[PDB]
């Protein structure tokens, strides 16, 4: 089952990290991802992302099964970029497409970059409750409170967008089961037949997911959620000693790449 | 028959939040009967229903139903005939309706099972009239309806293509009294036509009225498999196992407590009335 | 009268007909009112109108006053703190990531201090008999468990008006009795008002008032012993009569005549015992 955007309960140390510190670490790692220019810098960001994923405590098989389809999509996009752009040595040059050493290098780099963006986003969303993510997002946008900007609305919209993907897969499962019960066969024929069977589902999936996303806000409003101002917290939101773990993780990483970048 | 041998199901087996939905089920439901699946909330009735039509595969054990053998390693391939023969009405009708209109949704089922457009339309109209849905609602969206209307749409879609096994996860929830009685009589008449009906219910009066056999669950364990009379013989056993008694039996107990003993043990309202008249005679 | 709906029209969305048409009724303060009617009469529409989630078609001729404040655009939040509604679908009630978080959401919105919130959420979760599921995802629950969580989330804040939109439909009889007793006890202790939209006539027979709704119109309104004797009216509109009245009618058609003043199980039992004594 897909685990991106979906909160998986756990007890390891990354679950006790502050959601604000976790969000800052995620955004900082995403920023550092674009600062990788050398092969060794990409490798360093690779070990750091893999350590971040291992800190989640989920089994590697579970994480892989949760991130598989989007990993395959990233692989497809990287292969497309490898074919479209070429340079330096040429291997095959078969028809209008071509395969090049520079193209392969940049395809690998784009795959690594997008993959670890996905991994850090998934680690953030799995270990943090969606409303905790919204609270951390609103806290981060506190300076944006200047110029009379409704930061709470933006944070709630961001949380809804983050929850959109899990709602997409939940609705996919729901309609797949509903159609299976009444005789649909998504496991018959070749790829053409399966695509034909799954193509009438696309509009219902997105419409139902949007309806669920809006129903979440309806449920919040019905129970008195004027906004994030003036509320109390069931869960304590305070800095702690464990919050120094991301900082060093955000520090050491930086140091490495400063001594590891191409420049 | 529908046979379960040592059927266990575990929700998220590898996760730390592992929960055993069903634990070593062993029973044999007879074809052509009315079976009432009873139990407390969270006892595993919906998991059992989803196991009937192979929506969930068992973690362990074997299921034999409608010429099909479902094992932990069965898979979703080649299961269209099983669901041709076995139909399931979900506990929530929202998780069942997906089509643009009520008519299209109801006749989705017949279309998949070899009904021509004329036959599918006639069956859909007949079963929409049978479930007491207004004629003008057949071209409206299934989601622009009330909860009971959605329940009626789901029931009509389930019963449209004539399955030989009808599994109903609380189909009477959300239905008004007249609609509730009409649905119960519709299911009984369907069973009288040569079909098997399995019914998850929280109303013991329905069990005493329509059920031929009773299947009682508790925490995923099958605690009793007997007729309604034998299930409702003892009230201490019923209370001990999170279960209740028909209101007719409760009223008979109240009458006996006040000093008016009744012959036998009434379980249905006409039976209780006959017993009261016999006692007063 | 805690709630006052007066000349209320609602057409959904477009729809050709109004869900409610010229609806007017009053809810007595600190009472139990059972809103009953066939499927398709605007009971959930009434519930969502009282909250403020829906607005009447015409605003300057329809009135909705909840505990003295006229419901509107500028007083919706002053009303939502008075009205807590358990929805017909429990999935539409859940906000938090666990059962305790969902129960505590409404206490967070009311600025209840966390030391009190801990006790209130624990007591509410234990009250609906879900203490073993406090850390569970509310979507990974059975229908009755989801109903219990939805009821607990509303009974924790103890609003002046509790609306229950068929909140006992998917509960086992033990759970039905337990949660009905819990709601009654909370109502009596806190001097609250309960509107129970239900299809169970046994629960409606025990209410203080019964509102009868037909095609979005108030067909009848009164006490249970003034409504349920009208067998023809109830059967004509898709309703029925509770257990005791049906038993009385079968006894009458079987030759045993009983006084019409009998409206409860105990009264019927005593009357039958007296008949047997002779
Ligand atoms: N998706 C799920 N993931 C994990 N546990 C689940 C899930 N669905 C149900 N459960 C749990 O499995 C058990 C059985 O649930 P099930 O839905 O079979 O109950 P039920 O008998 O249908 O109950 P109800 O009468 O409330 O509908 C319960 O403890 C429930 O919390
Ligand atoms: N989302 C919607 N869009 C359009 N019409 C709707 C919608 N929901 C309900 N209706 C219609 O409005 C009317 C009132 O239905 P409502 O849901 O208020 O009744 P109810 O008594 O709560 O339902 P039930 O007893 O069947 O659960 C019905 O005619 C129904 O079809
Ligand atoms: Mg269930
Ligand atoms: Mg409704």
Numbering used by the authors:
A (entry chain C): 3 to 265
B (entry chain B): 2 to 282
C (entry chain A): 2 to 14, 17 to 281
List sentences quoted exactly from the publication behind this structure:
We substituted the catalytic glutamates in the Walker B motif in both ATPase subunits, which are required for ATP hydrolysis, to glutamine. While the purified double mutant (referred to as 2EQcryo) cannot hydrolyse ATP, it is still expected to bind nucleotides, which prompted us to use it for cryo-EM analysis. Compared to the open conformation, the ATPase subunits have moved by ~4 Å towards each other to adopt a closed conformation. The convex conformation of the coupling helices adopted by the solitary ECF module upon Mg-ATP binding becomes incompatible with the shape of the S-component.
Energy-coupling factor (ECF)-type transporters mediate the import of micronutrients, such as folate, cobalamin and pantothenate, in the majority of prokaryotes. Based on these fragmented structural insights, a model for the transport mechanism has been proposed in which a substrate-free solitary S-component with an outward-facing binding site topples within the membrane upon substrate acquisition, associates with the ECF module, and exposes the binding site to the cytosol, thereby moving the substrate across the membrane.
